Amino acid sequence: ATPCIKAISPSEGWTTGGATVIIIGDNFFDGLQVVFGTMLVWSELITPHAIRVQTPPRHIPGVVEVTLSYKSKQFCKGAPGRFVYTALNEPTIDYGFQRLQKVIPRHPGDPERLPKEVLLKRAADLVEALYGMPHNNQEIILKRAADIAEALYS
Amino acid sequence: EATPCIKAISPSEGWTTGGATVIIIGDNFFDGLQVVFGTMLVWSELITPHAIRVQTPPRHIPGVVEVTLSYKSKQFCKGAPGRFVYTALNEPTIDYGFQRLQKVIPRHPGDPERLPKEVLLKRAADLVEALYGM
Numbered sequence: 212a213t214p215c216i217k218a219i220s221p222s223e224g225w226t227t228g229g230a231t232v233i234i235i236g237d238n239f240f241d242g243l244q245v246v247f248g249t250m251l252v253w254s255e256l257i258t259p260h261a262i263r264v265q266t267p268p269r270h271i272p273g274v275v276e277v278t279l280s281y282k283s284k285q286f287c288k289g290a291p292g293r294f295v296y297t298a299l300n301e302p303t304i305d306y307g308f309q310r311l312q313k314v315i316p317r318h319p320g321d322p323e324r325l326p327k328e329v330l331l332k333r334a335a336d337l338v339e340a341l342y343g344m345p346h347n348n349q350e351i352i353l354k355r356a357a358d359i360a361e362a363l364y365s
Numbered sequence: 366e367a368t369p370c371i372k373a374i375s376p377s378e379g380w381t382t383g384g385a386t387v388i389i390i391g392d393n394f395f396d397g398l399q400v401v402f403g404t405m406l407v408w409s410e411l412i413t414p415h416a417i418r419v420q421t422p423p424r425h426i427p428g429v430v431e432v433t434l435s436y437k438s439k440q441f442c443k444g445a446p447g448r449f450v451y452t453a454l455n456e457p458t459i460d461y462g463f464q465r466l467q468k469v470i471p472r473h474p475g476d477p478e479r480l481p482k483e484v485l486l487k488r489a490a491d492l493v494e495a496l497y498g499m
Contacts, residue, residue: 231375233388233416258391260390301483311493334466334490352496353492356491357491359491
């Protein structure tokens with residue numbers, strides 16, 4: 212029997228993506244994929260009734276229908292989930308961390324998920340290391356970072 | 366028999382300030398089956414026979430708490446409980462990281478004398494991502 216979607220938690224994320232979401236339904240299995248509108252993402256299989264995905268980025272805020280796909284075949288077109296994308300405005304403590312989890316480099320032999328303290332440590336290291344640079348590298352990095360910031364928050 | 370159990374918690378972490386929505390994933394749930402965080406009864410709600418929606422309580426102290434289920438004084442999952450981890454913004458480990466960053470973060474026109482933790486993280490991340498390929 213085919214995979215179905217019964218609930219999505221959370222049912223709402225930032226347009227920048229990267230948010231962990233739990234898809235709850237029936238008949239899930241390994242290698243299944245989740246469709247956010249038209250965007251495919253892969254999913255980690257928790258149990259046959261729960262699947263874990265990371266929200267893909269979307270350039271426009273609003274409702275998207277959520278469906279499932281295996282090997283380019285689509286399920287749930289008749290009973291879709293709904294996920295909502297919102298525009299990110301004010302940064303938050305929780306977002307800053309999710310963000311750091313993605314961008315912070317991992318020394319060999321780390322856990323799959325770095326503890327908040329490590330992130331803050333490594334982050335501190337690299338930002339200090341930037342201050343002691345040829346300035347030619349500094350102007351570029353700061354211009355880059357300013358571009359990144361301008362694109363996420365508006 | 367049809368005895369309740371917990372395969373996973375999502376997320377498995379939260380702040381001591383509480384309020385987080387968490388999904389409890391397992392088999393054999395039903396209307397009225399209740400969720401316990403240590404010994405406190407948390408607000409729960411059935412989604413399907415396989416997923417319960419809870420909302421975390423505040424906690425005075427960080428640490429791992431065992432999550433169990435219970436119905437009519439009878440208590441399940443004591444053998445192999447779910448484990449939710451509470452962390453606080455004030456663990457020395459965490460607060461140190463923040464101070465370091467507070468001094469290392471560049472200042473723009475119109476900045477407070479101390480930068481909100483959100484701002485430290487935002488800028489930190491932006492600079493760390495920009496450091497790629499370099």
